[PDB]
Amino acid sequence: LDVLNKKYSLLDHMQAMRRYLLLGQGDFIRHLMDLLKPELVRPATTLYQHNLTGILETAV
Amino acid sequence: REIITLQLGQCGNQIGFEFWKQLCAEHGISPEGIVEEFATDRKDVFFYQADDEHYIPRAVLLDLEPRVIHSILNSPYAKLYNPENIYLGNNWASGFSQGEKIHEDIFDIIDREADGSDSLEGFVLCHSIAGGTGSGLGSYLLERLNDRYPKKLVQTYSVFPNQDEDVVVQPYNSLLTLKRLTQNADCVVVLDNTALNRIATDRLHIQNPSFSQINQLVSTIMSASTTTLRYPGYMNNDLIGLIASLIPTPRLHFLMTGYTPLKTTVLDVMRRLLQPKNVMVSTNHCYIAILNIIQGEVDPTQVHKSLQRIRERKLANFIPWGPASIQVALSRKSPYLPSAHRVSGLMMANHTSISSLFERTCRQYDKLRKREAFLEQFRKEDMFKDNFDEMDTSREIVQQLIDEYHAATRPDYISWG
Amino acid sequence: EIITLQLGQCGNQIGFEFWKQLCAEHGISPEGIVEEFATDRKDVFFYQADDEHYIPRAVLLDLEPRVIHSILNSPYAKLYNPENIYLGNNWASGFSQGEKIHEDIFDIIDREADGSDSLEGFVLCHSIAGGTGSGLGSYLLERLNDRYPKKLVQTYSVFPNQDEDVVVQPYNSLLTLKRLTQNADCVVVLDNTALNRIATDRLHIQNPSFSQINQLVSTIMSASTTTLRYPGYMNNDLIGLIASLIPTPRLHFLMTGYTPLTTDKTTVLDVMRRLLQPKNVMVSTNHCYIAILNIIQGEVDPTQVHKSLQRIRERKLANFIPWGPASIQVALSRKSPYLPSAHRVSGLMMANHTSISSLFERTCRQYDKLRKREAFLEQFRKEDMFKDNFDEMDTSREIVQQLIDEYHAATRPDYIS
Amino acid sequence: FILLKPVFHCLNEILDLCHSFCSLVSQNLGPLDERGAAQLSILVKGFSRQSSLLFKILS
Structure with a gap:
């Protein structure tokens, strides 16, 4: 427990994964829901990963 | 996404100063x-990270006459809310004629700070009702805010002259300001002079004016109401997502407010907030x-099981043309404060007894x-609106507002107000 | 390999600061x-010299020699040492006096162009409409392309708007600009208006700003000539450099900007975006x-840099809309040792924009x-003999009107035509 | 991208197409159709096709 709790930050990884995959961070989600909307209006074949990874990083 | 904070007039910039001073003391600034060295709170909604690592509030000390601004400036907060966007009058007619010419x-200041955004979405006003610099100029300014930015909300923390009558045009200045509130504004959190002046004696007495005491409560009202903006949460990170549950039709844009601290458990703060004595406002x-x-x-x-218990005993009543409930925003109490542990709940709610305050x-x-x-016996009326149509137009507009608020208290408000 | 052809009184002043700065940055x-503190490649500009008493390749042609004794008595004449110096203010007189000395x-161009191991192009340090440079530089520009048809002619022409006294200046500007359009290969433009404002922004200089403008242009212009003179092969001469900035031949004027104006944490995105900001840009729908x-x-x-482009791009801080795919680039380079106290980064702009059409208008x-x-029109004798029916000044208008039209047309998707 | 991929092969044909277009404008020189239109349009098709095959990278 003493290694995993700080050499691999296991408890922060739980706390962060709740901040993101469970929407807990809130701000990241309100802003990303805005910025990402005109991309996701379009049909799914017209979406590409370089738009998406850039806009994620922009929201972060 | 960001919120601007157009504090206006002599009273509004005092309580705005107190507001930023409270936000400064609460944030790591x-x-x-x-x-500050010990400084996670969220600043981007309210502060701009200028190149000195200066967190500057998104303010505008948008006053009209000189007195208290200099004493705000020469404070120890002189360069907090201040990238120098400041600016430089007794009744609605005079104030409107001056709000025109300077505009x-x-x-340019509004546009300057608006272009200082990633996405603006709010204009919080600290508006003094019936006061001279609040009257007229504020009403002119309220119309222009929606003309120039028809997609941006105007929200008013209006401090209201509910008291015994100094100025004889005092009722008119409240009526002619109320017209704009009743159509141009998107939300109005209303604070009552007598209710706060009573609540002063209800904890620590005052006599002839000592605004600096009741202003402490006003600052806790603003800070409490913006708390869920200033920290993370799964819900209510933004002003419109907060205001949407409370104002169900666009004419019901006024909110009464309650505040408890005048060990703890949620059921006792819920019960307290609901009692009539704790509402900061006066069929x-x-x-x-x-x-x-x-x-x-x-x-x-x-928190949940507290709601259920407060439901079962029906200590609160609503109106059955639509669903409703009490809604609870649980938040982290702020560190960087003394005694950041006393539970200190606030409420805001739409309740139809505010109609009587207008009435x-x-x-x-x-x-x-x-x-x-x-009728405003100064030539800035007599050379401007000596036909007196506007106040009677305001009076039938507020009479429709009273009728709408009283129409809200029937089972058939699915029909028209 | 490249040579400067500084001319008129303006050209000598920007060229005297050019060589005075060039020896400084090349450790000479x-x-x-x-100098004893001394890799590089002075080679292109710097005439490689017997003792490593390095030389420019500069032909110090001049006309109405009144002030230039005061440039030639400087210690930098020992740098411009080959004794290749040679001795009205209207465009026609300046053009024709060029012919009368030609x-x-x-010849003393060839006496140096035969010495250069591989001449590539001619750098015209020059002003639009400026006095004794007016006519003269544009006259040479009519001749260079007939006698040297393969070599490329670039003009670092500072432009006549000074926020704004010469009464023939607009005529001279039109007549020079027919040449700068029709006869140059590329033009880098500077507004005296913007440079006055920039001097009043970083410091307190506007009208006086002139010898100070020499420092600002030489800081721009040492950078524009940097990949020629130092290792790093992003494009190690004049002609890889510019092909990124011109898609269709007539549309070849380029804007200027130079990020850290008081350079004496930062990051690439700062130094590259501070460059596109039109208020930091030295230029003034x-x-x-x-x-x-x-x-x-x-x-x-x-x-x-690879990640910088995302946070440029997705916040729409640049706006590429040619008829095709062209976009924004970076040319990384060595810190230059003429800057003593330096910011750890700096940068410089060069971009084919549409807004320069405003100064043309x-x-x-x-x-x-x-x-x-x-x-x-003056009825002056040189002004009349060059064109007794003023037909050159007529035809000079339609070409710059077409520059207005082409700038108004290459801006649309139409430019298959 | 020199580690061996279809990306490298498609870049190789793009570079071959570039050199051949260089060779064409460097030999024809003057503004004359020396049956240059067929070769030029073939390279317009090859470039359009392999630019669209260059845009496979977003999968």
């Missing part, structure tokens, strides 16, 4: 504006929607309008 | 001596960038109103 000088009446913010070291496990000033207008009276 | 004394000043490059110099972290208007007043 020095009176210099520089990052190129000040609209059947019923709640429309209630939201309360519990800022504290509270265990979240208690008081309607009746005061009718007394003066059925008398012969001092 | 006013005498051309390699033979020597043409709808506006496309047709293509952009930045030459950036200092301790760039090389992994940042001022130019065309300032010609047209004085042309249709017919008072500042």
Whole structure:
């Protein structure tokens, strides 16, 4: 427990994964829901990963 | 996404100063504006990270006459809310004529701070009702805000002259300001002079004016209401997502507010907030929607079962043309404060007894309008609106507002108000 | 390999600061001596010299020699040492006095162009409409392309708008601009208006700003000539450099910008975006960038630039709308040792934009109103003999109107035509 | 991208197409159709096709 709790930050990884995959961070989600909307209006074949990874990083 | 904070007039910039001073003391920010050493709170909504590592509030000290601004400036907070966007009058007619001529000088300031955004979405006003610099100029400015930015909300923390009558045009200045509130504004959190002046004696007495005491409560009201903006949460990170549950039709845009601290458990702060004595504002009446913010070291496990118990005993009543409830915003209490552990809950709710507060000033207008009276006997009225149509137009507009608020208290408000 | 052809009194002043700055950055004394603190490649510009008493390759042609004794008595004459110096203010007189001296000043080009191991192009340090440079530089520009048809002619022409006294200036500007359009290969433009404002922004200089403008242009212009003179092969001469900035031949004028104006944490995105900000830009509707490059110099972290473009791009801080795919580039380079106290990074702009059409519109208007007043046609004898029916000044208008039209047309998707 | 991929092969044909277009404008020189239109349009098709095959990278 003493290694995993700080050499691999296991408890922060739980706390962060709740901040993101469970929407807990809130701000990241309100802003990303805005910025990402005109991309996701379009049909799914017209979406590409370089738009998406850039806009994620922009929201972060 | 960001919120601007257009504090206006002599009273509004005092309580705005107190607001930024409270936000400064609550956030990790020095009176210099520089990052404090022990400083996670969220600043981007309210502060701009200028190149000195200066967190500058998104303010505008948008005043009209000189007195208190210099004493705000020469404080230890002199360079906090201040990238120098400041600017430089007794009644609605005079104030409107001055809000007109200057407006190129000040609209540039709004546009300047608006272009300082990633996405603006709010104009928080600190508006003094019936006061001279609040009257007229504020009403002119309220119309222009929606003309120039028709997609941006105007929200008013209006401090309201509910008291015994100094100025004889006092009822009119409240009526002619109320017109704009009743159509141009998107939300109005209303604070009452007598209710706060009573609540002063209800904890620590005052006599002839000592505004600096009741202002402490006003600052806790602003800070409490913006708390869920200033920290993360799964819900209510933004002003419109907060305001949407409370105002169900666009004419019900006024909110009464309650505040408890005048060990703890949520059921006792819920019960307290609901009692009439704790409302900071003075026929059947019923709640429309209630939201309360519990800022504290509270265990979240208690919060739901507290609602259920408060439901079962029916200590609160609503109106059955639509669903409603009390709604609870559990928040972290702020560190960087002393005794950041006393649970200190606030409520805001739409309740139809506020109609009577408007109806008081309607009746005061009718007394003066059925008398012969001092209709703003200064030439800035007589050269401007000597046909007197606007106040009677305002009076039928507020009479439709009273009728709409009383129409809200029937089972058939699915039909028209 | 490249040579400067500084001409008129303006050209000598920008060229005297050019060589006075070039020896400084290449570690060379006013005498051309390699200073004892000394890799590089002075080679292109710097005439490689017997003792490593390095020389420029500069042909110090001049006309009405009144001030230039005071440039030639400086210690930097030992740098411009080959004794290749040679001795009205209207465009026609300046053009025709060039013709009346031309033979020597043409031959002593070859006396140096035969010495250069591989001449590539000619750098015209020059002003639009400026006095004794007016006519003269544009006259040489008519001749260079006939006698040297493969070599490329670039003009670092500072432009006549000074926020704004010469009455023939708009006519001279039109007449020079017919040459700068029709006869140059590329033009880098500077507004005296913007440079006055920039001097008043960084410091307190506007009207006086002149010898100070020499420092600002030489800081721009040492950078524009940097990949020629130092290792790093992003494009190691004149002609890889510019092909990024011109898609269709007539549309070849380029804007200027130079990020850290008080350089004496930062990151690439700062030094590259501070460059596109039109207020930091040394230049003063709808506006496309047709293509952009930045030459950036200092301790760039090389992994940042690839990620910088995302946070430029997705916040729509640049706006590419040519008929095709062209966009924004970076040319990384060595810190240059003429800057003593330095910011750890800096950078410099060069971009084919649309908004320069505004200064062309001022130019065309300032010609047209004085042309249709017919008072500042002057009836002077040189002004009349060059064109007794003024047909060159007529035909000079339609080409710059087409530059207005082409700038108004390459801005649309139409430019398959 | 020199580690061996279809990306490298498609870049190789793009570079071959570039050199051949260089060769064409460097030999024809003057503004004359020396049956240059067929070769030029073939390279317009090859470039359009392999630019669209260059845009496979977003999968």
